[PDB]
Amino acid sequence: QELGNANFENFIGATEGFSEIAYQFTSHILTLGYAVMLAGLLYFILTIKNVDKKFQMSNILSAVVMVSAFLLLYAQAQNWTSSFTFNEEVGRYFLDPSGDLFNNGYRYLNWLIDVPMLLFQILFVVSLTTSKFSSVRNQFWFSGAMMIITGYIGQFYEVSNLTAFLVWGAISSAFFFHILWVMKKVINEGKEGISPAGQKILSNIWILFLISWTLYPGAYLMPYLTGVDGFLYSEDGVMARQLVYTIADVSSKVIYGVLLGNLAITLSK
Amino acid sequence: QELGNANFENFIGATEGFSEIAYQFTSHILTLGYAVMLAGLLYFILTIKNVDKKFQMSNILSAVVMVSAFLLLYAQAQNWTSSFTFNEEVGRYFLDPSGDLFNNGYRYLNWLIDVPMLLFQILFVVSLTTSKFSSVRNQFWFSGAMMIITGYIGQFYEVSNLTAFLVWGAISSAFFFHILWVMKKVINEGKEGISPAGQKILSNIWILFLISWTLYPGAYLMPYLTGVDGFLYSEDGVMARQLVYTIADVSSKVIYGVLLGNLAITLSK
Amino acid sequence: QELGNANFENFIGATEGFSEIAYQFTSHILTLGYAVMLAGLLYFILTIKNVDKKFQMSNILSAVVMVSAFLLLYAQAQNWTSSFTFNEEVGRYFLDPSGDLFNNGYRYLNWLIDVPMLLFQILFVVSLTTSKFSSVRNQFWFSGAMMIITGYIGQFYEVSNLTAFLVWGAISSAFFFHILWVMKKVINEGKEGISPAGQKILSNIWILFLISWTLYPGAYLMPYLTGVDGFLYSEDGVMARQLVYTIADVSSKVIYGVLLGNLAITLSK
Amino acid sequence: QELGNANFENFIGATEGFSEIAYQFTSHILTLGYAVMLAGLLYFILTIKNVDKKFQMSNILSAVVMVSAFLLLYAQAQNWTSSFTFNEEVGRYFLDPSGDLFNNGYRYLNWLIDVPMLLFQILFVVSLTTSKFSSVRNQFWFSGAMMIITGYIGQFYEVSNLTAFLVWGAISSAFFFHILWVMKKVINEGKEGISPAGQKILSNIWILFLISWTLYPGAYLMPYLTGVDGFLYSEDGVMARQLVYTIADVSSKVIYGVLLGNLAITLSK
Amino acid sequence: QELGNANFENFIGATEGFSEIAYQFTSHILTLGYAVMLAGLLYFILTIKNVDKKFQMSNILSAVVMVSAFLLLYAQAQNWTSSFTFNEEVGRYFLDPSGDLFNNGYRYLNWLIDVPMLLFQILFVVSLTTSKFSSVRNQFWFSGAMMIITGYIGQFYEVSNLTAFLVWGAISSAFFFHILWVMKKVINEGKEGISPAGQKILSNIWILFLISWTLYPGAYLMPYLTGVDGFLYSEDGVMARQLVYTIADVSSKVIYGVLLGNLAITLSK
Ligand SMILES: *C/C=C(C)/C=C/C=C(C)/C=C/C1=C(C)CCCC1(C)C
Ligand SMILES: *C/C=C(C)/C=C/C=C(C)/C=C/C1=C(C)CCCC1(C)C
Ligand SMILES: *C/C=C(C)/C=C/C=C(C)/C=C/C1=C(C)CCCC1(C)C
Ligand SMILES: *C/C=C(C)/C=C/C=C(C)/C=C/C1=C(C)CCCC1(C)C
Ligand SMILES: *C/C=C(C)/C=C/C=C(C)/C=C/C1=C(C)CCCC1(C)C
Ligand SMILES: CCCCCCCCCCCCCCCCCCCC
Ligand SMILES: CCCCCCCCCCCCCCCCCCCC
Ligand SMILES: CCCCCCCCCCCCCCCCCCCC
Ligand code: NA
Ligand code: NA
Ligand code: NA
Ligand code: NA
Ligand code: NA
Ligand code: NA
Ligand code: NA
Ligand code: NA
Ligand code: NA
Ligand code: NA
């Protein structure tokens, strides 16, 4: 069967197929995904009047990220259940082409608009010292865009052309390190001037950001983390990838937003 | 027909099939389920300004539980009507594999995020005495997560492997008793310092929590409560399970939230 | 073909079929149904600040009834259009089993949660004299629940077993008369102490309640009001039943809520 | 093929079929329809605090009309795209009976709840002189209901029985002239006492009301405005009818509501 | 295969078909489209109280544009995924007529209502000097309507009749230049009287307006920008057109609205 430049999920579903657990779990973890985002949207809106007017822009941007996140992640959950149908004879879910091939593209475009907002909102809670607001913002937005775009191109060849997949992934990584660098500066300059309590939170925010954001490139390689024809190049790798994405999404957006809200309250008078 | 690690609902629907009453009732009870959650969401939002600012976090967390509860339970209602199609010849609903196998997973992931919030919101209304806030919270969140996760794994083998089903159920029960223990402490310490009216409510909250939360493990075993090839291992057991879940969900979330709101008002000045 | 314990709508659609008018009208009247409930929801929310804080609980409960009413009635409207497909040869809509059998169950569960709220909200506008608040509430909630449950069971046998259908209907009627009795007391005690204007409204509320609530049992018997093989035991009876339900729903919930709001304004200072 | 008492759209789609333009345009104009209503809903809600409390009831009723309008007009849109499928051989859209026959009913019952509200809201902005509020209201509500009901019956025979179609249309027209009469009185009495600016607006409101409301009966006859086997008794007549309805709906509800809001501001202090 | 007066997307999908990348990308860019509009809607509503009451009409009109923009663009996204189904044998997406032919009409009607509001909202932030408010408004609204309508007619013949396609496109362009002319005047008169900061923003708004609005006519010709049987008259041209539309939509509505909000704040006291 000819699939072309398709995600590895389609190859597993078209050959081996998915077990009740593998299929159901992937459905539940994606469903929990968009559910958390709508729950977060309601939280950030109902807690806007809990911080000084100057910090409220942080809750608004968190809400903006939640909305778009809910829609894209919701569409993704529907794309999964639509691309795989149960086979009575063997008792496994196989690729149903009539429902379109499954693609992690809806999530990559969710990042495109999110990344910029997530990096931008912290600049409304913390105060830079030697770095210019506009300068930091422009760096985040540029590197952020190039990181997502390059990665979006590579994920299409994660099976059809392993070379292109890694080359683009590498280029993407370049911009990722630059973002980590700028964010590190923002955290340091942010700690200067605030109470020890605020510093404690910024320290936790940096750890959360570092770990949660690293999970994404991990999910990108998931199918090859145990080498070609490895343990992860199966339905196990599919479950792992979608699970990691969900954990990363909740941590990088919802939890990240809650911590910023807590810091905003700490600095509020 | 090969189903594998699927819920017992699929086995009844694939062999005996469901009667108009059995199928329709299950559809109505699941529909009423998500309907109540959206009605509750509107109630908790419209009554936020009825309690002092310090207690408002309780209404917000109730609203958060309602939202996710509406989405997951809605999907669960669709997972039912889609998995069973009517057969004109015999006049019963049989497993329609094209609509995917029915799984009580969506409800298990709803708990995962709910359990933590439900246990945490009471800590914004009552005041601990001989227990540390962070300590109690960490215990609830840990045991709560382990309880749901372990149970989620077991429910997949409720037919394929009765042994694994019970072992996991038992492990889950362990964490459940620990939660009941901590909650009992919270209630007692909560009663100390408040008016007799507030104590009266906390007493009712403890009874509600004890009964409603016990229903879940009951629904877990529902198909075997009358032993293998028993009265409950039929469409009657399916109706019973989904009914008990719905009663438990409404009691543990909506009614539990209303009582907390009433207590918040009682302590409001 | 054996339909079993199914509503009479399915028997008409499976034998005679439905004409363009019969089918279209039923679709339009059910569509208008959920449309009115969402319109009402918006009205009760936008008019909350039009009455004293003590009466606002009435608008909130009206809103709660609207929400659930919209969801259940929206589903009921889908249960119709899905259960009947057009036959080109004869030019009539016949039972399409793939879309499930049509059941007035979604509406019965909508009452289960509504009835309690509708009877309870009037206790926030009027002031009892010799009757205890808790006492009246408990009677409404108990008789209300037993009335709906018993009726829900009977409607399943409206064709399969005419005897069971009437027996349950009769038992249900018992609790209905008890509710009418308690409501009559509440109205009388409510009139005592308020202005002639307020009394005028309570008089209208009693008439509305009496007529609108009586329509339900009428819709229950609709198919046999002209005896077996009568004029109403046709597509005409189907249209009549769904029409009566819609009229009853709009009157008992929306109009009832508007009058309570007008009374609240009359008593507001 | 037997269609029976069906709208003429079905006859054109079942015989000649629809061209890409005819089908696409009808879809676009109906889509724009419900889109405008949801846009209007947001406008009337966000501008409520722009007028004195006494006039705010006008914005609320406009919002009520928008909601219902959005739901019914959305359904009407779906009814279209579902009833006609593309034929590859000939390259035209033909009647797809599996999607139900297309009916302009959803739009008629929409007028049933709208008409009364649209005629009633103007009574909260203008002040009657010699006419009684209750009197005018009762006339609008009665004639309004009889006008819609009679018309709703006739539209079912616009093809099957041209005689019944015209008779009902005529009866409907009777109540329409009575409404125009009462509205004319309301406008005149409304002009007395208000500023020249307010009078200027009421003059515009009367012209808008006169033209927009006249379009409906025009859309009713659309298929026979060029006589039987005429230019309009084709896909051209279908486009014309749905276009006229959309123009009428936007003018009679959205624009009408905006003008009433502007008048409210003019009289606001 | 006979398509008639259909968009070129259908001809590519009916002959060559679409690759996984071409199809998936178009789906992602359209999905991101409606997602951004709902995110913008939430932003404009949550920031209304950030500007003086006199400028708030700008946020309201932005919100109005977002709503209708979300619904239409959502409908446009669905029109895509439904019109093209995957072929297992060749591994490409081909025209699925059962899902209707794809038409960029839903986007042309979104402009019809947007264009007027987008041109009108700037008149609530800036102050004209020698130009009359009513005069400018009437010109925008007239030329705006004629521009969209004429273009909407031409796009139907972008393949069937290249002559009609260009003629209408040309006529449309005429009204486009007139709009650019009037907008230029508004910007100039707007700069007079405001601070250098406000002027800086209006300068950016003019550049954004000029570029973003020019993209639309570019997307209109996209398939012929490399001449007939050119590089762009392929799936590459389809991706390019939908991408350009998405960039134009986000820039002309969301970004344009954000800049107006920033200017409103700059002039706010
Ligand atoms: C809420 C969305 C977030 C935080 C998205 C983050 C995305 C990344 C950090 C992506 C990084 C990637 C690489 C560094 C290489 C491989 C491709 C990417 C895009 C997954
Ligand atoms: C609103 C959701 C709630 C209250 C969820 C509660 C879940 C439980 C109490 C689950 C308990 C279980 C056991 C003790 C053993 C069997 C497996 C479980 C998870 C059902
Ligand atoms: C908004 C929902 C309302 C007011 C529901 C009311 C329901 C009843 C009054 C039901 C009564 C019935 C009987 C008295 C006998 C037959 C069965 C019932 C449940 C229809
Ligand atoms: C927003 C809805 C409105 C303004 C509806 C108005 C409806 C009419 C004016 C209907 C009039 C009719 C006739 C005068 C004769 C033919 C049948 C009708 C109902 C279309
Ligand atoms: C948010 C919607 C906007 C800004 C829409 C703008 C539309 C145009 C500028 C359209 C212009 C066109 C021409 C100048 C010629 C070809 C046809 C059009 C309509 C695409
Ligand atoms: C303060 C709260 C106390 C409320 C008391 C009564 C209200 C609860 C109503 C629920 C009762 C329903 C029980 C159903 C009985 C089983 C029916 C079987 C068919 C005969
Ligand atoms: C002010 C509250 C009282 C309102 C009474 C005024 C009239 C409004 C209700 C009109 C009801 C119309 C129902 C039509 C009757 C049946 C139609 C027969 C079809 C020819
Ligand atoms: C005071 C403002 C007056 C204008 C507002 C009303 C807007 C409606 C404009 C009427 C034009 C509709 C005609 C549509 C033509 C369709 C072809 C009809 C064939 C008989
Ligand atoms: Na997003
Ligand atoms: Na599936
Ligand atoms: Na939940
Ligand atoms: Na089904
Ligand atoms: Na309800
Ligand atoms: Na149907
Ligand atoms: Na309406
Ligand atoms: Na179609
Ligand atoms: Na729009
Ligand atoms: Na597709």
Side-chain angles (χ1 to χ4, degrees), chain A residues 1-48 50-53 55-131 133-184 186-268, chain B residues 1-48 50-53 55-131 133-184 186-268, chain C residues 1 3-48 50-53 55-131 133-184 186-268, chain D residues 1-48 50-53 55-131 133-184 186-268, chain E residues 1-48 50-53 55-184 186-228 230-268:
Chain A
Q1 189 171 5
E2 187 63 13
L3 296 178
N5 301 328
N7 293 180
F8 98 105
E9 291 81 355
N10 298 309
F11 288 87
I12 305 302
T15 61
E16 306 178 0
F18 298 107
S19 60
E20 177 61 356
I21 296 181
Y23 176 85
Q24 291 297 1
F25 173 78
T26 304
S27 298
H28 306 143
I29 208 51
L30 288 179
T31 301
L32 174 59
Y34 68 73
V36 169
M37 300 306 172
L38 197 59
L41 171 60
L42 189 57
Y43 176 84
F44 294 116
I45 288 182
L46 288 178
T47 60
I48 294 189
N50 285 1
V51 298
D52 295 356
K53 193 65 191 300
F55 302 121
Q56 291 185 357
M57 182 60 65
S58 180
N59 292 44
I60 299 180
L61 292 183
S62 290
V64 166
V65 170
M66 297 300 78
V67 174
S68 58
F70 165 78
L71 291 178
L72 282 315
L73 292 189
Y74 179 91
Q76 189 65 328
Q78 305 303 337
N79 180 16
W80 171 259
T81 60
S82 301
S83 299
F84 308 103
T85 303
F86 186 79
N87 185 331
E88 314 175 13
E89 284 68 7
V90 24
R92 300 178 64 87
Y93 298 83
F94 290 90
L95 179 62
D96 185 357
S98 61
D100 294 354
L101 273 48
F102 179 89
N103 197 243
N104 296 306
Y106 296 95
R107 187 182 303 270
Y108 277 75
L109 297 203
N110 185 25
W111 303 330
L112 181 57
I113 64 180
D114 289 353
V115 166
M117 297 301 75
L118 289 173
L119 296 171
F120 185 49
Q121 63 173 143
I122 191 172
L123 295 178
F124 289 90
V125 177
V126 305
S127 303
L128 297 183
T129 62
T130 52
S131 299
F133 176 100
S134 62
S135 181
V136 166
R137 181 196 65 193
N138 292 354
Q139 296 188 30
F140 281 142
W141 284 13
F142 181 81
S143 293
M146 295 306 304
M147 178 182 62
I148 303 302
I149 295 177
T150 57
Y152 175 74
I153 295 176
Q155 65 86 25
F156 277 112
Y157 303 99
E158 69 178 21
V159 173
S160 60
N161 187 346
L162 191 67
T163 296
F165 171 69
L166 294 175
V167 168
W168 289 108
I171 300 178
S172 182
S173 299
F175 295 97
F176 174 63
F177 293 119
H178 177 243
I179 292 179
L180 290 173
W181 186 263
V182 177
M183 180 56 61
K184 185 51 178 174
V186 174
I187 298 296
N188 290 346
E189 299 188 20
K191 280 176 168 176
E192 295 179 351
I194 65 176
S195 60
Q199 299 182 357
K200 173 71 176 183
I201 301 181
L202 274 180
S203 295
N204 295 344
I205 290 182
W206 169 246
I207 299 302
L208 178 65
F209 181 92
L210 197 56
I211 299 175
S212 64
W213 279 60
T214 299
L215 289 176
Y216 290 97
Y220 182 91
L221 298 169
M222 187 57 63
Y224 300 111
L225 286 188
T226 57
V228 201
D229 292 359
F231 151 80
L232 284 185
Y233 195 83
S234 59
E235 65 177 7
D236 294 336
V238 172
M239 301 177 63
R241 166 177 275 182
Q242 299 306 333
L243 169 62
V244 167
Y245 276 139
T246 302
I247 292 175
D249 282 347
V250 176
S251 306
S252 64
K253 310 183 205 281
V254 167
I255 298 179
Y256 172 80
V258 168
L259 286 184
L260 282 180
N262 287 357
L263 181 53
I265 296 179
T266 295
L267 304 181
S268 294
Chain B
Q1 189 171 7
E2 187 63 13
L3 297 180
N5 302 328
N7 292 180
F8 98 105
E9 290 81 355
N10 298 308
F11 288 87
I12 304 302
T15 61
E16 307 178 1
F18 299 107
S19 60
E20 177 62 354
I21 293 183
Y23 175 85
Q24 290 296 358
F25 173 78
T26 305
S27 299
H28 306 142
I29 206 53
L30 288 178
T31 302
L32 172 61
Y34 69 73
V36 169
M37 299 304 171
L38 196 59
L41 172 59
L42 187 59
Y43 176 84
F44 294 115
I45 289 181
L46 288 177
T47 61
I48 294 188
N50 285 2
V51 298
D52 294 356
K53 193 65 192 301
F55 302 121
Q56 290 185 356
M57 182 61 65
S58 181
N59 289 42
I60 299 180
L61 292 186
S62 288
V64 167
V65 170
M66 297 300 78
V67 173
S68 57
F70 164 79
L71 292 179
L72 281 316
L73 290 190
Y74 178 86
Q76 191 59 332
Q78 306 304 352
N79 187 17
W80 174 258
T81 59
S82 303
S83 300
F84 307 103
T85 302
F86 187 80
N87 184 332
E88 316 172 11
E89 284 66 12
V90 25
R92 301 178 63 87
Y93 298 83
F94 290 91
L95 179 61
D96 185 358
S98 62
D100 294 351
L101 275 47
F102 179 91
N103 195 243
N104 296 308
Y106 297 90
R107 186 183 302 272
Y108 276 74
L109 297 205
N110 185 25
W111 303 330
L112 181 57
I113 62 180
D114 290 355
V115 166
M117 297 297 76
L118 289 173
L119 295 174
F120 183 52
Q121 58 173 147
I122 190 174
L123 296 179
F124 288 89
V125 177
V126 303
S127 301
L128 298 182
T129 62
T130 54
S131 299
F133 178 99
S134 62
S135 180
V136 166
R137 181 197 61 193
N138 292 354
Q139 297 187 27
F140 281 142
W141 283 13
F142 181 80
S143 292
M146 295 303 304
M147 180 181 62
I148 304 303
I149 295 177
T150 58
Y152 176 73
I153 296 176
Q155 65 86 25
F156 277 111
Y157 302 98
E158 69 178 20
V159 174
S160 61
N161 186 348
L162 191 67
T163 295
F165 171 70
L166 294 174
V167 169
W168 289 108
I171 300 178
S172 182
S173 298
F175 295 97
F176 173 63
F177 292 117
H178 176 244
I179 293 180
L180 288 172
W181 185 261
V182 178
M183 180 55 62
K184 184 52 177 175
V186 174
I187 298 295
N188 291 346
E189 300 186 20
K191 281 176 168 177
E192 297 172 358
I194 66 176
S195 60
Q199 300 182 358
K200 172 71 177 182
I201 301 180
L202 277 176
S203 296
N204 296 343
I205 291 182
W206 170 245
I207 299 302
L208 179 64
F209 182 92
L210 195 58
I211 299 175
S212 64
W213 279 60
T214 300
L215 289 176
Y216 290 97
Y220 182 90
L221 298 169
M222 187 58 63
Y224 300 110
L225 286 188
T226 56
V228 193
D229 292 359
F231 159 79
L232 285 185
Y233 196 83
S234 59
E235 66 176 10
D236 294 332
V238 172
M239 302 177 63
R241 166 177 276 182
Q242 298 306 333
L243 169 70
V244 165
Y245 275 138
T246 303
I247 292 174
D249 283 346
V250 174
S251 305
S252 64
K253 309 183 206 282
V254 178
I255 298 187
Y256 171 82
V258 167
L259 289 190
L260 283 184
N262 288 357
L263 180 55
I265 296 179
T266 296
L267 303 182
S268 294
Chain C
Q1 56 185 164
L3 300 179
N5 301 329
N7 292 179
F8 98 105
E9 291 82 353
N10 297 309
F11 288 87
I12 304 302
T15 61
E16 306 179 7
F18 299 107
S19 61
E20 178 61 355
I21 296 182
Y23 175 85
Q24 290 298 357
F25 172 80
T26 305
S27 300
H28 306 142
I29 207 55
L30 287 178
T31 301
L32 174 59
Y34 68 73
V36 169
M37 300 305 171
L38 196 60
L41 171 60
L42 186 60
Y43 177 83
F44 294 115
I45 291 181
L46 287 178
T47 61
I48 293 189
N50 283 1
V51 297
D52 295 356
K53 193 65 192 301
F55 302 122
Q56 291 185 358
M57 182 60 65
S58 182
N59 293 46
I60 299 181
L61 292 185
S62 290
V64 166
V65 169
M66 298 299 79
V67 173
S68 57
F70 164 78
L71 290 180
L72 281 314
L73 282 184
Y74 181 90
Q76 189 60 329
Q78 304 302 353
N79 183 12
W80 174 257
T81 58
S82 303
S83 300
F84 307 103
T85 303
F86 186 79
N87 185 331
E88 310 180 14
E89 284 66 11
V90 24
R92 301 178 63 87
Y93 297 83
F94 290 90
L95 178 61
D96 185 358
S98 63
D100 295 353
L101 274 46
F102 178 88
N103 197 243
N104 296 307
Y106 297 96
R107 186 183 302 272
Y108 276 76
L109 297 204
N110 184 24
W111 303 329
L112 181 58
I113 62 181
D114 293 359
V115 166
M117 297 300 76
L118 290 173
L119 294 174
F120 182 51
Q121 58 172 148
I122 190 174
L123 294 181
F124 289 91
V125 177
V126 303
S127 299
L128 298 183
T129 63
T130 53
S131 298
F133 177 99
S134 62
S135 181
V136 166
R137 181 197 63 189
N138 292 353
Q139 296 187 28
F140 282 141
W141 284 13
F142 181 80
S143 292
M146 296 305 303
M147 179 182 61
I148 304 302
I149 294 177
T150 58
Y152 176 73
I153 296 176
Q155 65 85 25
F156 277 112
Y157 303 99
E158 69 178 22
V159 172
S160 61
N161 187 347
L162 192 66
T163 297
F165 171 69
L166 294 174
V167 169
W168 289 109
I171 300 178
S172 182
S173 299
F175 295 97
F176 173 63
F177 292 118
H178 177 244
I179 293 179
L180 289 172
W181 186 261
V182 178
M183 179 56 61
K184 185 51 177 175
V186 174
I187 298 296
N188 291 346
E189 300 187 21
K191 281 177 167 179
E192 296 175 1
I194 66 176
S195 62
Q199 298 182 355
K200 174 71 176 184
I201 300 180
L202 275 177
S203 295
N204 295 342
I205 291 181
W206 170 246
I207 300 302
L208 178 65
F209 182 91
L210 196 57
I211 299 177
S212 64
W213 279 59
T214 299
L215 289 176
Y216 290 98
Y220 181 91
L221 299 169
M222 187 57 63
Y224 300 110
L225 286 188
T226 56
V228 190
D229 294 353
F231 159 79
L232 285 184
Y233 195 82
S234 60
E235 67 178 9
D236 294 333
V238 172
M239 301 177 63
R241 165 178 277 183
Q242 298 306 332
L243 170 60
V244 166
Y245 275 137
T246 303
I247 294 177
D249 282 346
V250 174
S251 307
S252 64
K253 310 182 202 285
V254 178
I255 296 187
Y256 172 81
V258 168
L259 291 187
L260 282 181
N262 290 354
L263 180 54
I265 296 180
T266 295
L267 304 182
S268 293
Chain D
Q1 189 175 11
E2 188 64 10
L3 299 182
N5 301 329
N7 292 180
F8 100 104
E9 291 81 354
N10 297 308
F11 286 87
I12 304 302
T15 61
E16 305 181 0
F18 298 107
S19 61
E20 178 61 355
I21 297 180
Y23 176 84
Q24 290 298 358
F25 173 77
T26 305
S27 300
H28 305 143
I29 207 54
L30 288 179
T31 302
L32 171 61
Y34 68 73
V36 169
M37 300 305 169
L38 196 59
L41 172 59
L42 189 58
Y43 176 84
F44 294 117
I45 290 182
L46 289 177
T47 60
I48 294 189
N50 285 1
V51 297
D52 295 356
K53 193 64 191 301
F55 301 121
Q56 291 186 357
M57 183 59 65
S58 182
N59 291 46
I60 299 182
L61 292 185
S62 290
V64 167
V65 168
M66 298 300 78
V67 174
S68 58
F70 164 79
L71 291 180
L72 282 317
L73 290 190
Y74 179 88
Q76 188 58 323
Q78 303 299 352
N79 184 17
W80 175 257
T81 59
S82 301
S83 299
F84 307 103
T85 303
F86 186 80
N87 184 332
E88 312 177 11
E89 284 71 0
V90 25
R92 301 179 63 86
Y93 297 83
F94 290 91
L95 179 61
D96 185 358
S98 61
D100 295 353
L101 274 48
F102 178 87
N103 196 240
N104 294 309
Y106 295 96
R107 184 184 302 273
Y108 276 74
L109 294 204
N110 181 29
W111 303 326
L112 182 50
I113 79 182
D114 290 356
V115 165
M117 297 297 77
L118 289 173
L119 294 174
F120 184 51
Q121 62 173 144
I122 192 166
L123 294 181
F124 289 92
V125 178
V126 304
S127 299
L128 298 181
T129 63
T130 53
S131 298
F133 176 97
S134 61
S135 180
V136 167
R137 180 196 63 193
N138 293 353
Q139 296 188 28
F140 282 141
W141 283 14
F142 181 80
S143 293
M146 295 305 303
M147 179 182 61
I148 303 305
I149 294 177
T150 58
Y152 176 73
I153 296 177
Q155 65 86 25
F156 277 112
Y157 302 98
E158 69 178 21
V159 173
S160 60
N161 186 349
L162 192 68
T163 296
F165 171 70
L166 294 174
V167 168
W168 290 109
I171 299 178
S172 182
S173 299
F175 295 97
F176 173 63
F177 292 118
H178 177 243
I179 293 179
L180 289 173
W181 185 262
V182 178
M183 180 56 61
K184 184 54 178 176
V186 174
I187 298 296
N188 291 347
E189 299 187 22
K191 281 179 164 180
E192 295 177 1
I194 65 175
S195 60
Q199 297 182 353
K200 174 70 177 182
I201 300 182
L202 275 178
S203 296
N204 294 342
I205 292 181
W206 171 245
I207 300 301
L208 179 64
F209 182 92
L210 197 57
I211 299 175
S212 64
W213 279 60
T214 299
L215 289 176
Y216 290 97
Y220 182 91
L221 298 170
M222 186 57 62
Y224 300 110
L225 286 188
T226 57
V228 274
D229 183 9
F231 162 78
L232 286 185
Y233 195 83
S234 59
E235 66 177 10
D236 294 333
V238 172
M239 302 177 64
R241 165 177 276 181
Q242 298 306 333
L243 169 61
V244 166
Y245 275 136
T246 303
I247 295 178
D249 283 346
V250 175
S251 307
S252 64
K253 308 184 203 284
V254 181
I255 299 186
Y256 172 81
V258 168
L259 289 188
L260 283 184
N262 287 357
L263 181 56
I265 297 179
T266 295
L267 303 180
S268 294
Chain E
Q1 189 171 3
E2 186 62 12
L3 297 179
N5 300 331
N7 292 180
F8 98 105
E9 291 82 354
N10 298 308
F11 288 87
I12 304 302
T15 61
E16 307 176 2
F18 299 107
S19 60
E20 177 61 355
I21 294 181
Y23 175 85
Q24 290 296 359
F25 172 78
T26 305
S27 299
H28 307 141
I29 207 53
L30 287 178
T31 302
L32 173 60
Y34 68 73
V36 169
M37 299 305 170
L38 196 59
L41 172 59
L42 187 58
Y43 176 83
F44 294 116
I45 290 182
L46 289 178
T47 60
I48 294 188
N50 285 4
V51 297
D52 295 355
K53 194 65 190 301
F55 302 120
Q56 291 186 357
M57 181 59 65
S58 182
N59 291 45
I60 299 180
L61 292 183
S62 290
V64 166
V65 169
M66 298 300 79
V67 173
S68 57
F70 163 81
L71 292 179
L72 281 318
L73 291 189
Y74 179 90
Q76 191 57 325
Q78 304 299 342
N79 187 25
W80 175 257
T81 60
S82 302
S83 299
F84 307 103
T85 304
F86 186 80
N87 185 332
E88 314 175 9
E89 284 66 11
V90 24
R92 300 178 64 86
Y93 298 83
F94 290 91
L95 179 62
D96 185 358
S98 62
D100 293 354
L101 274 48
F102 178 91
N103 195 244
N104 295 308
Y106 297 98
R107 186 182 301 271
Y108 277 76
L109 298 204
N110 181 21
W111 303 330
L112 181 58
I113 63 179
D114 288 351
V115 166
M117 299 300 75
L118 289 172
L119 294 174
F120 184 49
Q121 60 172 148
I122 192 166
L123 294 179
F124 289 90
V125 177
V126 303
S127 302
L128 298 181
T129 63
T130 52
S131 297
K132 218 219 215 82
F133 177 99
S134 63
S135 182
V136 168
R137 180 196 65 193
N138 292 352
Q139 295 187 25
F140 281 142
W141 284 14
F142 180 81
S143 291
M146 295 304 304
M147 179 182 61
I148 304 304
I149 295 178
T150 58
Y152 175 74
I153 295 176
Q155 65 85 25
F156 277 113
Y157 303 100
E158 68 177 23
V159 174
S160 61
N161 186 348
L162 191 67
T163 296
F165 171 70
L166 294 173
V167 168
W168 289 108
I171 300 177
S172 181
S173 299
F175 295 96
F176 173 63
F177 292 120
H178 176 244
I179 292 180
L180 289 172
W181 185 261
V182 177
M183 180 56 60
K184 184 51 176 175
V186 174
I187 298 295
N188 290 347
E189 300 187 22
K191 281 177 167 176
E192 296 175 357
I194 65 176
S195 59
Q199 298 181 355
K200 175 69 177 182
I201 301 181
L202 276 177
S203 296
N204 296 343
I205 291 181
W206 170 245
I207 298 301
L208 178 65
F209 182 92
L210 196 58
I211 300 175
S212 64
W213 279 60
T214 298
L215 289 175
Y216 290 98
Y220 181 91
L221 298 170
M222 186 57 62
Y224 300 110
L225 286 188
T226 57
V228 192
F231 159 78
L232 285 185
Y233 194 82
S234 60
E235 66 177 8
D236 293 333
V238 172
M239 301 177 63
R241 165 178 276 182
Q242 298 306 332
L243 167 62
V244 166
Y245 275 137
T246 302
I247 295 177
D249 283 346
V250 174
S251 306
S252 65
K253 309 182 205 281
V254 177
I255 297 178
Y256 172 81
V258 166
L259 286 186
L260 283 188
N262 288 357
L263 181 56
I265 296 179
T266 295
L267 304 181
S268 294

